[PDB]
Amino acid sequence: MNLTELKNTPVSELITLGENMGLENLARMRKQDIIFAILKQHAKSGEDIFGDGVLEILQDGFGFLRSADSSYLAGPDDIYVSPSQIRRFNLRTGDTISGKIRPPKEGERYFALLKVNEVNFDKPENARNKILFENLTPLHANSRLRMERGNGSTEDLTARVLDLASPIGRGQRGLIVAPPKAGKTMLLQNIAQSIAYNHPDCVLMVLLID
């Protein structure tokens, strides 16, 4: 069973599934431990379990695989990974891992990883032969990002202005200087829509702090 499947489900569907399983009232507690308990049940009676997420190394040597829908937070949803993986496949902080998991046995409360199926959407064999980050040779912007869609709606013109004010390409550093109440929120929203519409091949991430 995939974790991301129960992840993209709303809380009501998790409640309905837990009541279909015939257990203690699960709607009472967190989505986190809701998914935890329904997974524990369905894994008591079910296949191999599958999961995916991003890995963070702890100072104890082990690692935690967490979900972005929980914004990479600590909780029962996390997947425990042993340092033996971080020696065999030499895992790293921030690796997109997807693999098989099982329920925790006596005294344990974190799902244990079984076998890594995809490391950063790629082969673990090919996960060894990789290049280091700061060891790379940086360069200036070579390929430009097309933000103009060509339809000219009420908001698309905004992006068009950028295309004639400050062109952006892959590898460029953009800094927005704006006082409060200036309309930067939907500015980033329109930019994200345009770059997601024009380039569905590059993985796009946003960050909202406070």
Next chain:
Amino acid sequence: GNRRIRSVGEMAENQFRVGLVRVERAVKERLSLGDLDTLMPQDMINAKPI
């Protein structure tokens, strides 16, 4: 001729053998669930019972 003398050698050997069979039962109960290419023969045996 019927009474045998024992020294520190085989006495310590027997005590180490008792510790060894203890940790061997421990690591055998542990390995009964282990799988392939998931552990090194370092944490399988505990140094504390020896």
